Design a binder for this molecule. Structure first.
Ligand SMILES: CNCc1cc(OC)cc2c1CN(c1cccc(-c3nncn3[C@@H](C)CC(F)(F)F)n1)C2=O
Ligand SMILES: CNCc1cc(OC)cc2c1CN(c1cccc(-c3nncn3[C@@H](C)CC(F)(F)F)n1)C2=O
Lengths: 289, 281
């Protein structure tokens, strides 16, 4: 990055506590020594012979995002083989941290979250970005009940490995169209995000994604099989017809048939009136007591 | 390599002339000091890529795949000893000779398909079929060479990254199965047949990054032969079937060996010897 600070951020902030890990490195809650403003500081070990391409891609994605539903980016610091990414602190943490105390979210709470996640996804996809890691752990809630997408770690690793491999591609004139597709897009597109959101809606309703108790390799294997059935909500009478259909269209097995984020935004579940932050303020009141 | 010779090959061979580059490294013509026998020596400066390459070559025992004689390692230089092909690549040839005849193309395609049927039966993929990688020996025989891309894919594959529970099925598909299979070689053979007929692959005058973008863009149309009247209905059909856009519908190498173009009588090395006589004058 060109605007990186060649100094230790602990000269400007005090590390209050560790917030978690993530795809790579760790996140600390930090306080600005002068202003008293809270920030999230993500620290990663940046060795002298390391590639650099992944961290460069991650800060590029964050730096070029200017949307309410994507975590704000403040700046980056490089010091003594440690890279620090300064981002917006989200007071209630992740939806996963929340539902683990609170229990399953209500349909209206899931609906506001889905609409906020879809707004962030429509923004990302419009500027040729893919999150690729949509899940409860990556959806953050600030004190105002606002929703922000975080952890572009998986996205950065893929973007870096795709650029790296595009150098060793060679001439394409003899390449089959499917070979061209894995070289340029990895063999899939941004609609993988729409499916992840559908799994996230179930995760929020049932406290775990479908097949959580099945071997990670076996779940991948079952998806590769013919006659693979997309997951569904367990408790049939707990949820409205709009919620069941939202799950049905987001979890369309074929990406050619799966709706885009913009189309999804006009779905009855996320288009309904009365979806606002107040629904999430009620969730946070339950977190506090 | 477990069978590598830990000495300089220039103890046994005299380096005669550089034949070319290729995916990686350089290829030299070499002559055995005592027997006078000719070999091709592929020299690579210095790990899993080269291991996967020696293994692909060592485990091939088929007439239409360049014969492997062994490997040498001395002072950070790895040397791969293979069959020397006196007439060079089909690209070296057609650049002097001009377009191949339909019968010459048909024989070349049958030979390449025989080599591809063998590779696919061993679960190997060439992934770099083109005129420059199709070699011709002095007898007019056809051999597939440069397993550099295949080795680089193999090594890259050897080293999924997300969390499977939120992963879309097409994402899981590209991780377990590949984003493509061995039928990509069948398409590459269709392009090579056009290249042998026209002296260049389709869209050769278009920027490579642009070419990649037209291909991924749905509604991309498979290429065809430019001079419709010069070629037979069987040759036009062979181009149509090898260049099927859908990997599920594209015929296999053994299926293509029953196609009228490559099944016809009178397909022999003599057709290529007629071509080499044209090169000689
Ligand atoms: C386990 N609870 C997390 C937690 C609990 C909490 O409680 C008050 C507050 C926060 C977090 C995280 N966070 C934050 C803020 C900005 C970016 C990122 C980020 N950028 N890259 C990966 N991350 C996160 C998702 C990784 C990881 F592992 F921390 F979640 N995180 C908060 O402001
Ligand atoms: C440009 N003319 C080449 C040329 C001209 C020639 O004239 C009499 C003879 C030969 C060659 C090549 N060759 C050979 C033989 C075995 C393997 C390999 C090989 N193994 N890995 C990549 N290759 C080749 C395809 C790469 C490259 F760049 F050399 F073509 N090559 C010959 O016997």
């Amino acid at each position: 990055d060109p605007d990186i600070f060649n100094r230790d951020p602990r000269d400007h902030y005090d590390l209050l506590q560790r917030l978690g890990g993530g795809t790579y490195g760790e996140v600390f809650k930090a306080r600005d020594k002068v202003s008293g403003d809270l920030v999230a500081l993500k620290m990663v070990k940046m060795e002298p012979d390391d590639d650099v391409s992944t961290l460069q891609k991650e800060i590029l994605i964050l730096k070029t995002c200017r949307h309410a539903n994507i975590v704000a980016y403040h700046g980056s610091y490089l010091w003594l083989q440690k890279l620090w990414i300064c981002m917006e602190f989200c007071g209630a943490g992740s939806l996963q941290d929340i539902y683990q105390v609170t229990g399953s979210l209500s349909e209206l709470q899931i609906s506001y979250v889905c609409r906020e996640v879809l707004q962030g996804l429509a923004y990302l996809h419009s500027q040729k970005k893919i999150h690729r890691d949509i899940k409860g752990a990556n959806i953050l809630i600030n004190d105002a009940g606002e929703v922000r997408l975080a952890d572009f770690g998986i996205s950065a690793q893929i973007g870096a490995e795709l650029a790296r491999r595009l150098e060793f591609i060679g001439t394409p004139y003899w390449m089959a169209p499917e070979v061209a597709a894995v070289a340029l897009k990895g063999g899939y597109n941004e609609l993988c995000d729409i499916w992840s959101l559908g799994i996230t809606a179930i995760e929020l309703a049932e406290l775990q994604p479908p097949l959580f108790d099945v071997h990670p390799l076996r779940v991948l294997f079952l998806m590769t099989k013919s006659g693979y059935q997309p997951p569904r909500l367990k408790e049939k009478g707990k949820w409205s017809a709009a919620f069941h259909n939202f799950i049905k269209v987001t979890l369309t097995k074929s990406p050619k048939k799966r709706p885009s984020a913009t189309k999804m935004l006009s779905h009855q579940l996320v288009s309904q009136p009365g979806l606002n932050r107040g629904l999430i303020l009620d969730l946070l009141d339950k977190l506090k007591n």
